[PDB]
Amino acid sequence: KAWTWTWNPATGKWTWRKNE
């Protein structure tokens, strides 16, 4: 419940994303 939850191809594992 930290930030957005989208696909993170950068590493290969769905990682949270923050826009701040």
Residue 15 CB: number of other CB atoms within 10 A?
A: 14
Cβ within 8 Å of residue 11, ≥6 positions away: none
Q: What is the DSSP string of the chain?
A: --SEE---TTTTS--EE---
The token pair at 16 is 């949270």
First to last CA, the chain: 15
The Cα–Cα gap between 19 and 2 comes to 12
